[PDB]
Amino acid sequence: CQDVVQDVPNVDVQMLELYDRMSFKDIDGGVWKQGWNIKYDPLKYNAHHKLKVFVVPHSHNDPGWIQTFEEYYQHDTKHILSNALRHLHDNPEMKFIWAEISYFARFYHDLGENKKLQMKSIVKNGQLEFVTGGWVMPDEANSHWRNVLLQLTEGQTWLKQFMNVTPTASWAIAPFGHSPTMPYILQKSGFKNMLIQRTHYSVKKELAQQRQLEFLWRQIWDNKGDTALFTHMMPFYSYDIPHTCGPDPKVCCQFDFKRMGSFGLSCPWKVPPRTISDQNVAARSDLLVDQWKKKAELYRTNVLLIPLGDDFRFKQNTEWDVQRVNYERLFEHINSQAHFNVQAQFGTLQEYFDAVHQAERAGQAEFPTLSGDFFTYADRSDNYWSGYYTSRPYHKRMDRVLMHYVRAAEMLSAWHSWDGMARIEERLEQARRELSLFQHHDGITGTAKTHVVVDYEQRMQEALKACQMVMQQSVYRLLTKPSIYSPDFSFSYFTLDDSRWPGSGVEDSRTTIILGEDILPSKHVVMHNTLPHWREQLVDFYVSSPFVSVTDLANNPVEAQVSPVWSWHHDTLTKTIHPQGSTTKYRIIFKARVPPMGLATYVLTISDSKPEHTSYASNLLLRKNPTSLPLGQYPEDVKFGDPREISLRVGNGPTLAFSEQGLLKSIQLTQDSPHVPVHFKFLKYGVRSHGDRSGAYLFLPNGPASPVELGQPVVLVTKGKLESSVSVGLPSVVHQTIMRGGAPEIRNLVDIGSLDNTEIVMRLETHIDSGDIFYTDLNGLQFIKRRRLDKLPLQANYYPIPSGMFIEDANTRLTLLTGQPLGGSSLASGELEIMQDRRLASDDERGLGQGVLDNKPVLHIYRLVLEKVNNCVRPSKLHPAGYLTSAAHKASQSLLDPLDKFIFAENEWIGAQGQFGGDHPSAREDLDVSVMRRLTKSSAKTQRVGYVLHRTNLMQCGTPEEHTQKLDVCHLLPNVARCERTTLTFLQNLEHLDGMVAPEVCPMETAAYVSSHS
């Protein structure tokens, strides 16, 4: 395996280094506003060296944005596709590329057989070419790599089945900045080329000047270069026609033949297109070829890409005609006039890349190597697109919840073949497709109209319900004696209990386990562990009595803690935010121990009095002017006091100190160690009163954040043997620090209410000497080194925090792990901050035509890990990556893939079993089975199961960490007949594996395997 820590890769362009060197001056470059006046030598091209030009027609189709998916389909996309089919069929030389398979699949499914065959023919003959072939063109900032892969696989699996094609070129013209997670996944999915567009205008200028817009994009840790993917960055401000023909949009706009008037479009530069005629074709060609030759100056080969399209283009037959006929007249003239030395034609994206590499192999070009990312994007001036790292955070959190439910449903149901009547495949396809759709660059990004956000939410809720159904049917089958198992495939044998979604104070959604002498003495519950190692985790359930005890399914007592159910209320009479306790419902908490990829059953039993193995938390309400807080049968009376500093320790874990406002002030790791200053603070950013306004996309703060005025908040302290917590009702946030013996969990119930033009940030202040360095993750896959740059505005220093961030010095590290993607930064040495929500009155002139005023309460979840790192083997100062410790990685897993909890619905579970998966291998902590998916329906003689295995890289810090078993996924199911290494989409077999043994992957690597079973 490659060493991902100790070898700094040697690349021609390293983005962090480039950022350090660049001046980012925003000067008027002339007609190319953000470039310079391009000059070319007319003698560069001649009879023996022509410029080959590929004009590639396209239509960007958003699967929801200002209309819903279905609205756009009915109003626009179905017409675009119908007319593409007609026009390509009738015009053999015309070409078209298509990206969004969600739309194509819908369209194709609805076609009659005659037209299906016509469609297959224009694909087979190369006129219509699929680019990327994902369900959507995903966001690259907020999306988790697992969901990027999910959506890619959904689109490509459809394409292989129905169109018999698998794209090897990717087209990403629209995401708001670009992540190296894309080439990582694409290169491991058979791709050979990719194209990107939305990168900072200063980066475009810098790379264009050096002819570094085409590069071999490798991962930041990759010393050898085996991850490299050829990447083409487009040079100009937009992917529209005015910004794709060459540097002067006043000229290029004249070659968008939809802009002459009858279509309701015009040219901003006030010179319209004119129909090409015999009397103007020479002058028109002069102008166009001059633009092309200028654009060609920015690249290294004699092969030029000219995209021809825009959003929802090619809708009407007349538009197809007007573009095609005019371009054909230009081609006929240009190609026949030797003096131009140009050969121009309609082409596809693959045709462009094939020609580029032909030129490369002929020895006419060598390409630079590059590592890094392309965040944070700015399209002009100081307009940095860091707002969408946070916009609509409820749905960003929902994404991560659904991500896990899809994984768990696919895994739990994979163990068996299911009858068609069970509707397992149907429900899983629904769930995968809704989650995939949300990866769209107007979905998870929070940049859609309110009614479209509501549509995505409804789709995701349906998907969650589908997952639940599949999960609970699977648990019932896995844990019931086979000769007793009698499934009704519509029945709910278990209900899922989720303690963090939608969350306390967001929705009262969980079911109370109702026990009583005169109703039901006991209840079975089951935990699932999707991770491939034994896991212990505290779990909680609501119960109708505090006198409940827990046993395992050997009837062994399990230590438990009972706590009250606390709900916070904004009291509109007293004008205070204060907690109320239930007098009929209680929380029972205990440690569940669950096999790798397995299930464990426990029993909750009522008694008339305090059980031997159950303890009760104390509760202390700190406020001036307290009133009584009765708790029914709960055996411990609530205590009251004036606000004061408090200190808590659970188990042998850290000791946490809190201010009188209930906010963390210090962490003491051990009994003898220092009280390390770690302060939580809430602040607010505002909006500018002049100039450009923040909106769904842009973050344009009116200076540094100002502290939120806290007043005298009510603080609730719960102290238990297993779990303790401090909660405080702040303006807009109920902030909760939870201690279970390791790194604390932080929960924020964020309700920005009616606070207009406000962004609420949570900041951590420490004395860690981090300087200008911090680390943030990319798509939950890797941690990249960031440098705060004072030459850039505050909003430019904001990055996506899709799963975590950290700061460190020689001795100490503070890591904040997240359960939802949000924006964040380190704006000063020793600080971390992460945006919670934003409510914005104005539009930011990027097309949405609304602000963000549809905020709703959301429960954000985090883990906070303070660690000593003086003993850790870390990358050198010049290495662009960082790596988590074991504790931080496990903390991230606790947020993203918690235990699943099931409550048996009926009174008695006949044939119940105690455990599933006790014999599953417990793999090394850095290895995950990211995907387990049965690929075949029940009628297949040879069953196939697909696995995606990911190994992260954790720092070596002196912990021996011994005794784990080799995980061979190909032997997880019995009767294996073959094992193949495949592309990550499972669509191509790459290696036939000897002994039918799937070898474990290297650090930072991801591999897919398919086992076949007789």
Ligand X SMILES: CC(=O)N[C@@H]1[C@@H](O)[C@H](O[C@@H]2O[C@H](CO[C@H]3O[C@H](CO[C@H]4O[C@H](CO)[C@@H](O)[C@H](O)[C@@H]4O)[C@@H](O)[C@H](O[C@H]4O[C@H](CO)[C@@H](O)[C@H](O)[C@@H]4O)[C@@H]3O)[C@@H](O)[C@H](O[C@H]3O[C@H](CO)[C@@H](O)[C@H](O)[C@@H]3O[C@@H]3O[C@H](CO)[C@@H](O)[C@H](O)[C@H]3NC(C)=O)[C@@H]2O)[C@@H](CO)O[C@@H]1O
Q: Which residues bind Zn ion (CB under 5 A)?
A: 62, 174
Q: Answer yes or no whether residue 268 interacts with ligand X by CB under 6 A.
A: yes
- CB proximity list for 72: less than 8 A, separation 6 or greater: 61, 62, 63, 64, 65, 312
Nearer to ligand X (CB atom), residue 397 or residue 441: 441
Beta strand 193-196 pairing with 169-172: parallel
Distance CA 784, CA 374 (A): 12
Q: Answer yes or no whether residue 33 interacts with ligand X by CB under 6 A.
A: yes
Q: Answer yes or no whether residue 260 interacts with ligand X by CB under 6 A.
A: no
Q: What is the DSSP string of 425-492?
A: HHHHHHHHHHHHHHTBTTTTTS-S-HHHHHHHHHHHHHHHHHHHHHHHHHHHHHTB-TTT----TTS-
Judge contact between 833 and 827, C-beta under 8 A.
Answer: yes
Q: Answer yes or no whether residue 30 interacts with ligand X by CB under 6 A.
A: no
**Dihedral Cα 378, 384, 385, 390, nearest 10 deg:** 160
Q: Which of residues 816-845 bind ligand X (CB under 6 A)?
A: 845
CB of 388 to ligand X, least distance (A): 9
Judge contact between 645 and 658, C-beta under 8 A.
Answer: yes
Beta strand 745-750 pairing with 733-739: antiparallel
What is the amino acid identity at position 123?
V
* Lookup: tokens for 339: 């003096």
Q: Answer yes or no whether residue 416 interacts with ligand X by CB under 6 A.
A: no
Distance CA 163, CA 396 (A): 33
Nearer to ligand X (CB atom), residue 695 or residue 804: 695
CB of 392 to ligand X, least distance (A): 13
Residue 187 interacts, among ligand X, Zn ion, none and using kind-specific CB cut-offs from 5 to 8 Å, with none
CB of 809 to ligand X, least distance (A): 39
* Lookup: tokens for 354: 């094939």
Q: Answer yes or no whether residue 369 interacts with ligand X by CB under 6 A.
A: no
Q: Pick the stretch among 219-227, 298-306, 308-316, 740-748 that binds ligand X (CB under 6 A).
A: 308-316
Nearer to ligand X (CB atom), residue 200 or residue 441: 441
Query: Sign of the CA dihedral 416, 417, 422, 424?
Result: positive
Residue 456 interacts, among ligand X, Zn ion, none and using kind-specific CB cut-offs from 5 to 8 Å, with none
Scan for tokens 């939870």, then name that residue. 738
* Binding-site member from 441, 449, 863, 874 for ligand X (CB under 6 A): 441
Nearer to ligand X (CB atom), residue 103 or residue 883: 103
Q: Answer yes or no whether residue 240 interacts with ligand X by CB under 6 A.
A: yes
Q: Answer yes or no whether residue 846 interacts with ligand X by CB under 6 A.
A: yes
What is the amino acid identity at position 173?
I
3-class DSSP state of 78 = helix
Distance CA 100, CA 73 (A): 12
Nearer to ligand X (CB atom), residue 266 or residue 871: 266
CB of 55 to ligand X, least distance (A): 17
CB of 62 to Zn ion, least distance (A): 4
Distance CA 889, CA 926 (A): 8
The residue number with the shortest CB distance to ligand X is: 847
Residue 568 interacts, among ligand X, Zn ion, none and using kind-specific CB cut-offs from 5 to 8 Å, with none
Q: Answer yes or no whether residue 693 interacts with ligand X by CB under 6 A.
A: no
Number of chain residues interacting with ligand X (CB under 6 A)? 23
DSSP designation for 568: E
3-class DSSP state of 114 = helix
Q: Answer yes or no whether residue 444 interacts with ligand X by CB under 6 A.
A: no
Question: Residues 405, 411, 416, CA angle at the centre, nearest 5°?
Answer: 135
* Binding-site member from 9, 15, 34, 378 for ligand X (CB under 6 A): 34
Distance CA 560, CA 591 (A): 8
Nearer to ligand X (CB atom), residue 80 or residue 466: 80
CB of 57 to ligand X, least distance (A): 13
Instruction: Strands of 27-118 (E only): list them.
Output: 51-60, 96-98
* Binding-site member from 45, 65, 130, 171 for ligand X (CB under 6 A): 65
CB of 22 to ligand X, least distance (A): 18
Q: Pick the stretch among 58-66, 68-76, 225-233, 452-460 that binds ligand X (CB under 6 A).
A: 58-66
Q: Pick the stretch among 299-307, 311-319, 539-547, 924-932 that binds ligand X (CB under 6 A).
A: 311-319
Judge contact between 385 and 177, C-beta under 8 A.
Answer: yes
- CB proximity list for 787: less than 8 A, separation 6 or greater: 16, 19, 20, 772, 773
Q: How many CB atoms lie within 10 A of CB 885?
A: 21
* Binding-site member from 83, 238, 461, 495 for ligand X (CB under 6 A): 238
Q: What is the 3-state secondary structure (H, E, C) of 751-777?
A: CCCCCCCEEEEEEEEECCCCCCEEEEE
Judge contact between 930 and 406, C-beta under 8 A.
Answer: no
* Binding-site member from 52, 60, 295, 329 for ligand X (CB under 6 A): 60
CB of 60 to Zn ion, least distance (A): 6
Q: Answer yes or no whether residue 58 interacts with ligand X by CB under 6 A.
A: no
* Binding-site member from 158, 217, 221, 237 for ligand X (CB under 6 A): 237
CB of 440 to Zn ion, least distance (A): 8
Q: Answer yes or no whether residue 91 interacts with ligand X by CB under 6 A.
A: no
Residue 268 interacts, among ligand X, Zn ion, none and using kind-specific CB cut-offs from 5 to 8 Å, with ligand X
Q: Answer yes or no whether residue 62 interacts with ligand X by CB under 6 A.
A: yes
Q: Which of residues 894-913 bind ligand X (CB under 6 A)?
A: none
CB of 475 to ligand X, least distance (A): 40
Q: What is the DSSP string of 12-39?
A: SEEHHHHHHH--------SSSTTS----
Q: Answer yes or no whether residue 174 interacts with ligand X by CB under 6 A.
A: yes
CB of 27 to ligand X, least distance (A): 11
Residue 901 interacts, among ligand X, Zn ion, none and using kind-specific CB cut-offs from 5 to 8 Å, with none
* Binding-site member from 67, 447, 737, 776 for ligand X (CB under 6 A): 447
CB of 510 to ligand X, least distance (A): 36
Residue 237 interacts, among ligand X, Zn ion, none and using kind-specific CB cut-offs from 5 to 8 Å, with ligand X
* Binding-site member from 7, 290, 297, 311 for ligand X (CB under 6 A): 311
Nearer to ligand X (CB atom), residue 136 or residue 864: 136
Q: Pick the stretch among 41-49, 441-449, 867-875, 899-907 that binds ligand X (CB under 6 A).
A: 441-449
For the chain, the first-to-last Cα distance in angstroms comes to: 33
Q: Answer yes or no whether residue 375 interacts with ligand X by CB under 6 A.
A: no
* Binding-site member from 214, 248, 310, 831 for ligand X (CB under 6 A): 310
Judge contact between 394 and 837, C-beta under 8 A.
Answer: no
* Binding-site member from 144, 205, 232, 313 for ligand X (CB under 6 A): 313
Judge contact between 636 and 619, C-beta under 8 A.
Answer: yes
CB of 783 to ligand X, least distance (A): 28
- Strand order across the 812-818 sheet: 639-641, 618-622, 715-719, 724-730, 733-739, 745-750, 858-868, 812-818, 804-808, 773-778, 782-787, 881-882
Using CB under 6 A as the criterion, which residues of the chain lie in contact with ligand X when the complex forms? 33-34, 60, 62, 65, 174, 237-238, 240, 249, 265, 268, 310-313, 380, 441-442, 447, 845-847
